[PDB]
């Protein structure tokens, strides 16, 4: 009915979903063969939203897997849950972006965009009414930040109506990951502020600080860092997949939060988060799960929450909970932290409660916030972007591909107007 495809592009977003589909497989009781083994039909009555059942119940995920090389194809294919994906969707090229935007946008990405465009068309023809798209890619690299950038510019020609979830990792102030990382940011966000509806700026740096303090894990496996990205995304779409006392789709999560057609740059949060041995020694109350959500520890990005203001507080609570204690404490945070909110927007808390917790807990909280300290995310990169344009370095990897110099400065003016709009109401 309400149907959503999930598209992965670039080496980052290809392996995020590879652990993320597993939880979606396990929350609904299916197998790598797609065999339904859920005991209660609560895991079946909304199985259709991410799946297209065909020929005796082998559910295929509504997923598209795109790469510029066959390197990341076989690793997902031979890896865990490799037999579940449809081999019709395994569309790829033979180039590799080499961390170059105009290769991923103009040169090499312009060839492979036509093949999956019909694949976007094909699964959307077999449904009654689409709902919106979710997209995992990168903003630091070259493949996902160059090819997935152009894909959103052609979804609006097909479907100018629905919503666009563009989940992508962002640079950190501490240690840069790639050399052209400020180049891959300003040129991407130039297209992200044009035709997208939400981005979740997840820092790679602060995810270790989550794991170093709460999880206390000395050996961060990349399966485990995306596992904390996995449980964040499954809590967002819990209303469309499970009943409860209050349901809230992705459009209701959209319409409650974004106040102006640019300011939709949100950071996520999740509670509870701790190691193994601290299970019994703390309390599973509404009050203990409340104050964890509003700490700098729970900030998945490396921005300071007491250097901004919460505009729209989204509380997606999961589990059998008492509504009044939710109604109690969401009042109590504004009686404590009235400076920490925007002042002219009253009643900043939006609450959606499904009565089903995720697997592994008894009561959880999925937070998405809007701090105006995310203005500093675009303050720090606009200087690093203009750190190398003043010396015109690496121009022969872009103009040699055929990039305009004004393409930098047009993005550079719209980058600096963006932080003026957080400044408008702060």
């Amino acid at each position: 009915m309400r149907e959503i495809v999930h598209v992965q592009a670039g080496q980052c977003g290809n392996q995020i979903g590879s652990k993320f589909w597993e939880v979606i497989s396990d929350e609904h009781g299916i197998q790598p063969d797609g065999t339904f083994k859920g005991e209660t039909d609560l895991q079946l009555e909304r199985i259709d939203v991410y799946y297209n059942e065909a020929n005796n119940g082998k559910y295929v995920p509504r997923a598209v897997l795109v790469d510029l090389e066959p390197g990341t194809m076989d690793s997902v294919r031979s890896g865990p849950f490799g037999q579940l994906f449809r081999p019709d969707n395994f569309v790829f090229g033979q180039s590799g972006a080499g961390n170059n935007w105009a290769k991923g946008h103009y040169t090499e990405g312009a060839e492979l965009v036509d093949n999956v465009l019909d694949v976007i068309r094909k699964e959307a023809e077999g449904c009654d009414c689409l709902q919106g798209f979710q997209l995992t890619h990168s903003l630091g690299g070259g493949t996902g930040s160059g090819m997935g950038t152009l894909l959103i510019s052609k979804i609006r020609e097909e479907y100018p109506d629905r919503i666009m979830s563009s989940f992508s990792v962002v640079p950190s102030p501490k240690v840069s990951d790639t050399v052209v990382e400020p180049y891959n940011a300003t040129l991407s966000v130039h297209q992200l502020v044009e035709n997208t509806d939400e981005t979740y700026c997840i820092d790679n740096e602060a995810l270790y600080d989550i794991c170093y303090r709460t999880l206390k894990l000395t050996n961060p496996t990349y399966g485990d860092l995306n596992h904390l990205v996995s449980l964040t995304m499954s809590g967002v779409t819990t209303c469309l997949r499970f009943p409860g006392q209050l349901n809230a789709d992705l459009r209701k999560l959209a319409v409650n939060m974004v106040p102006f057609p640019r300011l939709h740059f949100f950071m996520p949060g999740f509670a509870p988060l701790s190691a193994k041995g601290t299970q019994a020694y703390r309390a599973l109350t509404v009050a203990e799960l409340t104050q964890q959500m509003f700490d700098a520890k729970n900030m998945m990005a490396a921005c300071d929450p007491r250097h901004g203001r919460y505009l729209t507080v989204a509380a997606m609570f999961r589990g059998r909970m008492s509504m009044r204690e939710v109604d109690e404490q969401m009042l109590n945070v504004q009686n404590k932290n009235s400076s920490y909110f925007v002042e002219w927007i009253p009643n900043n808390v939006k609450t959606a409660v499904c009565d089903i917790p995720p697997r592994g807990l008894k009561m959880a909280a999925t937070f998405v916030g809007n701090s105006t300290a995310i203005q500093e995310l675009f303050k720090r990169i606009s200087e690093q972007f203009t750190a190398m344009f003043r010396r015109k370095a690496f121009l022969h990897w872009y103009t040699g591909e055929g990039m305009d110099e004004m393409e930098f400065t047009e993005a550079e003016s719209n980058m600096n107007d963006l932080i003026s709009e957080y400044q408008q109401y702060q």
């Binding site: 080496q11 972006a97 690093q384 690496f394």
Partner: protein
């Protein structure tokens, strides 16, 4: 799939290739006769970039051996590695150039350049994912300089966009053999700026310093020096020959490490590079060897890295390394202030971690260590390595010594003058950008 071709020109091309292809037979489990044992199929995971399949697992190297002299080629055609290579891939010469440019740029090269470019095209038409070139050469060789500049003058006409990689030896300012090496190094820099993506340099002496102190090899020769360079060669290919969490192909290396199309000459470094006993009394962590990367007893070119200014430092790790202390130690490098950058590039870092640890040569002098770093650091210490060689070239040129070999071989003397103004602004650009 992706397939990379190697070309070996000169005697430095011969025996370095006699080590690198020897090492790859160990790291994929391929017997040197030409076929594979059936146990090494699971190890043989995406080995297709170098080895065509033939009949039943028989794996020819996509490799070309080019020499003007048949002597050292017969060493390949005597040992165990004779039956591995293809015979018509071996194209030999008869008359030697003797470290002279126009003897290696016009005389014997132009009778053999048309034979070898076919063998390039015969092998490269099988490729659908042709990535790059491993061309190995010297700087003072007749075919090391005269044929290498002519060869790169012709493949850019043929293939163009596809990448290239050059490995070579930096001539030491104190200890070196051929007197024409200040001459030919200016000649091999003249027209190879335009026709080479990247070119790497190592010193004979900077190998020796770690050989005597850390390896404790007090009788080294060109046997063990080929093994140490080949580990740096193999560590780049580990991003391609295996499946890593965050790896990098050859087009991406030049995209990060070339800030300007003329200054594109970094160098290498490797650590931990010690003997087999000293690793027993020491637990080499991530912060141990990464801090060992940036001390002057670890660079592979004997120069002053503290008097150079780092611009784009590239890091490829091997072995089971967690990224947390990686994200700490590179930040802990930034806590130190002796590592100088330029004002416009703070973000010149590259992150690469592969699962496979380096495996050591059988009967060698190394030790099985899980952690290893192949450090690549483009810096302005190359400019200080330019002035030590620009001093040698001009003063012997002023007396016009040794000109009477270059005259009659089909070569002009004004070409020496144009390369002087060409190399003068090159070392200026390190200070202009810096």
């Amino acid at each position: 799939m992706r397939e990379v071709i190697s070309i070996h020109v000169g005697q430095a091309g011969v025996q370095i290739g006699n080590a690198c292809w020897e090492l790859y037979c160990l790291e994929h489990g391929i017997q040197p006769d030409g076929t594979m044992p059936t146990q090494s199929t699971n190890e043989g995971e995406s080995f297709t970039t170098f080895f065509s399949d033939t009949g039943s697992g028989r794996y020819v190297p996509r490799s070309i051996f080019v020499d003007l002299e048949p002597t050292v080629v017969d060493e390949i055609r005597t040992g165990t590695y004779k039956k591995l290579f293809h015979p018509e891939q071996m194209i030999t010469g008869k008359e030697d150039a003797a470290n002279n440019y126009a003897r290696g740029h016009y005389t014997v090269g132009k009778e053999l350049i048309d034979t070898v470019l076919d063998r390039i095209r015969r092998l490269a038409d099988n490729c659908s994912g042709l990535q790059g070139f491993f061309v190995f050469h010297s700087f003072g060789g007749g075919t090391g300089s005269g044929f290498t500049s002519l060869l790169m003058e012709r493949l850019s006409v043929d293939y163009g966009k596809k990448s290239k990689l050059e490995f070579s030896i930096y001539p030491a300012p104190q200890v070196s053999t051929a007197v024409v090496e200040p001459y030919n190094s200016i000649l091999t820099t003249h027209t190879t700026l335009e026709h080479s993506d990247c070119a790497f340099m190592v010193d004979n002496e900077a190998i020796y310093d770690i050989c005597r102190r850390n390896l404790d090899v007090e009788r080294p020769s060109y046997t063990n020096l080929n093994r140490i360079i080949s580990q740096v060669v193999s560590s780049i290919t580990a991003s391609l020959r295996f499946d890593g969490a965050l790896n990098v192909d050859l087009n991406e290396f030049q995209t990060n490490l070339v800030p300007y199309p003329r200054i594109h000459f970094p160098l290498a470094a490797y650590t931990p590079l010690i003997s087999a006993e000293k690793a027993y009394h020491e637990a080499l962590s991530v912060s141990d060897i990464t801090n060992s990367c940036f001390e002057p007893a670890n660079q592979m070119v004997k120069c002053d890295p503290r008097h150079g200014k780092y611009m784009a430092v590239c890091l490829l790790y091997r072995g089971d390394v967690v990224p947390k202390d990686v994200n700490t130690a590179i930040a802990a490098i930034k806590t130190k202030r002796t590592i100088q950058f330029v004002d416009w590039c703070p973000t010149g870092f590259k992150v690469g971690i592969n699962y496979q640890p380096p495996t050591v040569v059988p009967g060698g002098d190394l030790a099985k260590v899980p952690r290893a770093v192949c450090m690549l650091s483009n810096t302005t210490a190359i400019a200080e390595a330019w002035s030590r060689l620009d001093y040698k070239f001009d003063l012997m040129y002023a007396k016009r010594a040794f000109v009477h070999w270059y005259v009659g071989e089909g070569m002009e003397e004004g070409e020496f003058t144009e390369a002087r103004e060409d190399l003068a602004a090159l070392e200026k650009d390190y200070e202009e950008v810096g």
